[PDB]
RNA sequence: UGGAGAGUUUGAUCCUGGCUCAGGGUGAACGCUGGCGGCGUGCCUAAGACAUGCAAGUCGUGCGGGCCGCGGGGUUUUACUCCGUGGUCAGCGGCGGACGGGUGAGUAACGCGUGGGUGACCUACCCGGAAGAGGGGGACAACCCGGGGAAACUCGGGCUAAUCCCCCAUGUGGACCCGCCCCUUGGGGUGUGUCCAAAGGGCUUUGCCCGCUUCCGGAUGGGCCCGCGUCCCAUCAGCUAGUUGGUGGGGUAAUGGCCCACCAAGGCGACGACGGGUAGCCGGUCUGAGAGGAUGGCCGGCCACAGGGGCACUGAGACACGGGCCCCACUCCUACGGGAGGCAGCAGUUAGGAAUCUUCCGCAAUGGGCGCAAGCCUGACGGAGCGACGCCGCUUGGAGGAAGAAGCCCUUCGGGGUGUAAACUCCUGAACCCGGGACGAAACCCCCGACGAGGGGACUGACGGUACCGGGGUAAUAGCGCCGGCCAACUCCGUGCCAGCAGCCGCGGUAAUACGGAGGGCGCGAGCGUUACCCGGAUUCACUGGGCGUAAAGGGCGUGUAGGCGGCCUGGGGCGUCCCAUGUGAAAGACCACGGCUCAACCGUGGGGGAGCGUGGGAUACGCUCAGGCUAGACG
């Protein structure tokens, strides 16, 4: 008994909580943004987009989202938002959306 | 991490290594990426160490990391001698 | 290990005379001298016509019983001559004739094949210097086959090499009675050997 | 090289997909006679383009759906049900041999 | 470079035909017997259950402490406190724990094999290249206090470090949306917009080492996809609803019904779907003249599994044998609430079985993880142990020695045999005693030199006082099967269709070469014989290479679907087919050569062969295809 490398599990747990939290913010803000854009809120719909974009790229900093997982999210988000805005949109803040 | 080490091919009390290039995780006598030399620890024949130095140099040219002994034998056949 | 036991009974069963003793086998005593019949309670009874098997079996038993060798070894030696290029019958005899114990015998160092075996075993022999006590060692072309310096004083080695004075030697050999040396010049050929054997049969026997 | 094949479009019933009937030929390993074996591939035809009866070249592609790894590369020769025939009829015979039987 | 058959259906014969044997092989086992050594090999059953020990850790050169002790300080003393330093313990953090080791249960499948695809992807550490590391904030263990529990263990409160976590900045660059260009599935370039970096440590401390960040590239390893190949039963014939496809979305590194909503009604099947059975697949291996049959232990490659089932977390990587959760079963602890386990790791125990080893030595060597290093860990490994289990080597002696001892066997009682065998003479001298005593081990490290190249130095062996060398030295284990024929080896006695033998034919009922013993003989020999299984013989499933009037075998006949097969001439294609080049066909094994150990077994080096498939080029007689023509088939 006592294969002191229990520590690994010990740590795994923390990390889990850390990651788990990181992604909720991502999702939350993403909807937050998509939902806005949807009902054409341009200016603020993008404002939130950006925060989201950031959190995402940030998760990829460490081993949270990491890689293309981050890339995906970003495009799927920007796509949804830019498209959703085509409801009289006119992307004010131009936030992350390339002019 | 690809390496350059020895692979046991002798036989009981009759060791004969093969200076090989293989990923670091394979059985020491498992599938290697390429042979590049051999070694008879007991020098039971005039020729008891050869090393395709042309080859060695190449692998080292790409992350090959030799065992301390593998490096020894190599050196001993001017693998690094940069005269 | 090797046969070991009454040997002239083989001499008799094989009909043909086998020199498994050297001296005496020349004296009016090899028994094949007045008693050329097989051993046992039936030696003198009429012989029924031998079967194709019998013949081959006997021919093999003969050749083999000559070089005094275990069927085990004999067979593998055969299977080897078989794979090697060249008429198997020959190749095979050439190989049997390459056993160290045989050469020591073919060089008059020993009176008989058995004796030569023992000389090899008790280290009284040399092969290009290094002594070799493996009676089944393959003597090959170029190999000099001396006699243990230490043994060079042994009465037996002396008497043997003595009478060897004069006696010629096989054309695939050559011995220097002085320093008690001899060279294995070449693998003897079928013609070179005069064995009372029909090796075409021995081949056929392992055909079955 | 992405394997390229040829066959007849025996099925046109799907959306953006066609059934190509690639016929193969080869000597039997033990009896050596050349034997004609075959197989259906569901080729991807986005534009509906290829219709029943065509002979198309099929080309190894990136998965498009489960059971679907080929795209119609090009048309070899248009129309020819003489081939679709063989297929259909062969299937039709099936619709028998089991408990009753199929008309000759 | 290669191929043998025999016995047995009859009064006899030919043929047909089954059965049977001789050979080779085995991870064997059983019997009688058993001396030495080398190499190799050893749970083939209960993927049954497991005591005990060991089997994955390592960094103090990422950080802060608890405890025990020593030395020196601010102290007049006291209290308190500061510094250095030894011992010890875990905690935080990092890398490894996804390798290495085991097993083959499941799986007939892209599992495996082979050849390809990835514009649809990932890859820690290693290597090359480019750029960078500026500033600020926080937490949680340890520790301290309190609470619950029989326990395993747990809950709350307070303090704190970092290469722990967060924020802002710098943007080499990279990421995303959009546009454009080149490319062609999601490849590459570019423009605007937004978004994203970093950590420190050590000193022989103004520099060098270790480390950190972003991007590109390499190297290795991998995911996924596809053509072809992969056992038995059709007394399994129809299977299918996420089932087949589509549109959109989720999901992953990534494609995809992988998952979901909506839409369409499709998808598979006799070229054998579905179902049943059996089974890890391969390199190979065994046998065979070959084709083929059989097989897949040991070794190498892949897969699957880790008491049974399901699931995710952390991560470069796991759905994670010595990590996690839940359910089941079983086991142990339990103050009955509740807990702890998983040898298909080494060795070992137990059970089952005809049957399968030491709870060994060592980390010296090779290899692996961590470390700047010294070094630590390594039941991986290297060795020793036991077992004729296999292969090879070796001994039980050599030479002389009677017309031939004794005993035993037979006799035509003259004699014949065991047999030069013995006794005996002489010679050598396994065991065994004495002495010497090894390769495998030179690196890491240290010093000069720049921590480079190069040069010098030091430490280090389990095996092992073994191998081997030299001296001395004893004649010093032989057994087992068989002798009617196949099949090599014959007599006497005993028995009397009994006792028994037996592979097949058969033998035994008073002259038995066939039972039992003896003498003698044949064959092998530390083995010999048996049983079991595979190939052979068996052209007895016949592709090589079998057949169907009466031996087994023509369908009761027709009409006809699919399928198989297709006259003569010419032209196009070039699918089959043939040729050349080229890539692949790993290592091992097989073959050849030379070499190392006194030989060989075993091993090292080198060389040649190799079907299959990929790519390019070529040929066109035949087959296919297309087109044209013809009348000799067919139809009218
Ligand atoms: Mg009869
Ligand atoms: Mg017969
Ligand atoms: Mg099945
Ligand atoms: Mg707290
Ligand atoms: Mg720039
Ligand atoms: Mg930033
Ligand atoms: Mg199974
Ligand atoms: Mg055959
Ligand atoms: Mg993850
Ligand atoms: Mg375990
Ligand atoms: Mg070690
Ligand atoms: Mg090491
Ligand atoms: Mg006979
Ligand atoms: Mg009688
Ligand atoms: Mg056959
Ligand atoms: Mg036939
Ligand atoms: Mg027949
Ligand atoms: Mg009949
Ligand atoms: Mg009829
Ligand atoms: Mg024709
Ligand atoms: Mg062609
Ligand atoms: Mg040699
Ligand atoms: Zn004689």
Curated annotation (Swiss-Prot), chain C:
**Gene Ontology BP annotations:** ribosomal small subunit biogenesis; translation
GO MF annotations for this entry? metal ion binding; rRNA binding; structural constituent of ribosome
Listed under GO cellular component are: small ribosomal subunit
InterPro entries the UniProt entry points to? Ribosomal_uS4, Ribosomal_uS4_bac-type, Ribosomal_uS4_CS, Ribosomal_uS4_N, S4_RNA-bd, S4_RNA-bd_sf
Q: Which SUPFAM superfamilies match?
A: Alpha-L RNA-binding motif
Report the cofactors: Zn(2+); [4Fe-4S] cluster
Residues annotated for Zn(2+) binding in this entry: 8, 11, 25, 30
Q: Where is the S4 RNA-binding domain?
A: 98-160
What are the record keywords, sorted? Answer: Metal-binding, Ribonucleoprotein, Ribosomal protein, RNA-binding, rRNA-binding, Zinc
Matches recorded under Pfam families: Ribosomal_S4, S4
Q: How is the cofactor bound?
A: Binds 1 zinc ion per subunit. In a number of structures (e.g. 4Y4O, 5FDV) a 4Fe-4S cluster is seen in place of the zinc cofactor.
Similarity field? Belongs to the universal ribosomal protein uS4 family.
Which PANTHER family does the record match to this protein?
A: 30S 40S RIBOSOMAL PROTEIN (PTHR11831), SMALL RIBOSOMAL SUBUNIT PROTEIN US4M (PTHR11831:SF4)
HAMAP family found in the cross-reference section: Ribosomal_uS4_B (MF_01306_B)
What does this protein's UniProt record list under function? One of the primary rRNA binding proteins, it binds directly to 16S rRNA where it helps nucleate assembly of the body and platform of the 30S subunit. Binds mRNA in the 70S ribosome, positioning it for translation.
| Quaternary organization | Part of the 30S ribosomal subunit. Contacts protein S5. The interaction surface between S4 and S5 is involved in control of translational fidelity.
Listed name of the protein: Small ribosomal subunit protein uS4
Organism equals Thermus thermophilus (strain ATCC 27634 / DSM 579 / HB8)
Gene name, Swiss-Prot/TrEMBL: rpsD
